[PDB]
């Protein structure tokens, strides 16, 4: 089985997230002022300056594939496997309002839900059969992204992100 | 495009075959006393000794895959792409008479129809995308088989195989 | 979801089967003196005798079922019908018309054929059957399963299993 280790700073964050929604009865305000598209954009910039100035892990092109994979994976996953029972009415209401179709989850949700995906990812990745060489390289790119997510946790996860009607 | 060269001894044989059926109005007697299953069995024996004693080419296991491919390919192909307009009533009558299902074309037809397949094969092989290394090895194994078929043409193709009914 | 009810005589048999292999550490002797090909051929005869004295009295429709079973089994066995212990046996058995690997149907018997009826609903869900054709088919499994239950003593001798 596949394991994707979560930085304990973000493990806590996930526990907080849970407490807020199904106990303190709160919801992330949608759309997030800073959505998943922009979070991902930000990482790529950060990745590119890092590879250039430092000391597969350095391959900026390989990074971009990961990021794109993430936003596709999220778009599909969110309404199926990443919601809490309480968050259901919000989703329905949000997607109901290019050709006047339903905006994709990536443009509406933020860091809170993106992180949730990293919990489900191993099971999903198990189901598509990755080659050895490609999987390791990918899993490493998640670690880097998670490290990035932990390193700037204060900026990506403001408490004021949550709501109460 | 893929080319499978036919030994001119067998090219003639194919021209004879044609003349017999839609001009001299003749039909191969079915089932053939010597069917395609046995022809193929014969080649494998001959391949195996011609390796052990001599002087992908000499690979007895690789040969066996080819032969098995041929009998699957033929079974499927015959009633679709290998018959002449006149031969249609014969096919219907033949298959109509393990669990009392329709005997597969391989157990009914012989050298006459097997050869026809080598005309259509390039078309068919184009449609399944073979890798470079595997295709060349395969095409060579057809040449050897065709060589074998030409070398013993008198035995495999008796004129008495055809009928007036 | 599709359900194929198993006669409780055969439900027990399946529980016995399990206990033998991964607890009492036993294996069906292969090849079975009476394999799946012959079991299936036996049913067809004793479907046709039964018929003599529109729906599921169609001997032709019966034959399609039986042939489907032997194709489905051939494919299914090494993937979804083995127990972890039975793996080495499969490898050894298939390793020994053109000197290819004999198909599972000519090697295995009533023990494994029955296992398939547990997995079948799942598999049949994945190929989209028409309403009219599925019901007719499911009924033909019931008949076969009753047949299998009716002669359970003959098809399932205990001596089918070994220590070695």
């Amino acid at each position: 089985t596949i394991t994707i280790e979560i930085p304990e700073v973000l493990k806590k964050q996930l526990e907080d997230d849970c407490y807020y929604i199904n106990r303190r009865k709160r919801l992330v305000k949608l759309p997030c002022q800073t959505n998943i598209i922009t979070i991902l954009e930000s990482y790529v910039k950060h990745f590119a300056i890092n590879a250039a100035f430092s000391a597969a892990e350095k391959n900026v092109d390989l990074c971009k594939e990961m990021v794109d994979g993430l936003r596709i994976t999220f778009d599909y996953t969110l309404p199926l496997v990443l919601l809490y029972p309480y968050e259901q009415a919000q989703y329905k209401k949000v997607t109901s309002s290019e050709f006047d179709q339903p905006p994709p989850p990536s443009y509406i949700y933020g860091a809170q839900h993106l992180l949730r995906l990293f919990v489900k990812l191993p099971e999903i990745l198990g189901k598509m059969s990755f080659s050895e060489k490609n999987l390791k390289a990918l899993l490493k790119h998640f670690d880097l992204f998670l490290r990035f997510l932990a390193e700037y946790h204060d900026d990506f996860f403001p408490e004021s992100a949550y709501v109460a009607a | 495009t893929i080319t499978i060269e036919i030994p001119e001894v067998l090219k003639k044989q194919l021209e004879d075959d044609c003349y017999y059926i839609n001009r001299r109005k003749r039909l191969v007697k079915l089932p053939c006393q010597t069917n395609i299953i046995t022809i193929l069995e014969s080649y494998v024996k001959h391949f195996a000794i011609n390796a052990a004693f001599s002087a992908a080419e000499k690979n007895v296991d690789l040969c066996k895959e080819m032969v098995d491919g041929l009998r699957i390919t033929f079974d499927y192909t015959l009633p679709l792409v290998l018959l002449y307009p006149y031969e249609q009533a014969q096919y219907k009558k033949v298959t109509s008479s393990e669990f009392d299902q329709p005997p597969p074309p391989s157990y009914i037809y012989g050298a006459q129809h097997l050869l026809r397949l080598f005309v259509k094969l390039p078309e068919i092989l184009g449609k399944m995308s073979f890798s470079e290394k595997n295709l060349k090895a395969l095409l060579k194994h057809f040449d050897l088989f065709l060589r074998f078929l030409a070398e013993y043409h008198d035995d495999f193709f008796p004129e008495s195989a055809y009928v007036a009914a | 979801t599709i359900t194929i009810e198993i006669p409780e005589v055969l439900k027990k048999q399946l529980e016995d089967d399990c206990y033998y292999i991964n607890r009492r550490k036993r294996l069906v002797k292969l090849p079975c003196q009476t394999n799946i090909i012959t079991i299936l051929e036996s049913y067809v005869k004793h479907f046709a005798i039964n018929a003599a004295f529109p729906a599921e009295k169609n001997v032709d429709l019966c034959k399609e079922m039986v042939d489907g079973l032997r194709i489905t089994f051939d494919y299914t066995l090494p993937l979804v019908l083995l127990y972890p212990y039975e793996q080495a046996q499969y490898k050894k058995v298939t390793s020994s018309e053109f000197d290819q690997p004999p198909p599972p149907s000519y090697i295995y018997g009533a023990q494994h054929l029955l296992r398939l009826f547990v997995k079948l609903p799942e598999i049949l869900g994945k190929m989209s059957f028409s309403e009219k054709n599925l019901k007719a088919l499911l009924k033909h499994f019931d008949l076969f399963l009753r047949f299998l239950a009716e002669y359970h003593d003959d098809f399932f001798p205990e001596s089918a299993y070994v220590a070695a």
Binding site: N59, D61, L62, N134, A137 | - | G68, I71, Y75, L81, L124
Partner: peptide, 29 residues
């Protein structure tokens, strides 16, 4: 590695009048 990346209807295996689905290996229970 530099990418996670690298057309004809085909004949299927048919049983009971329908194509056989591919199955991922699994221990029987």
């Amino acid at each position: 590695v530099t990418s996670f990346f690298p057309i004809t209807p085909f004949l299927p295996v048919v049983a009971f009048g329908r194509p056989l689905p591919k199955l991922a290996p699994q221990n029987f229970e």
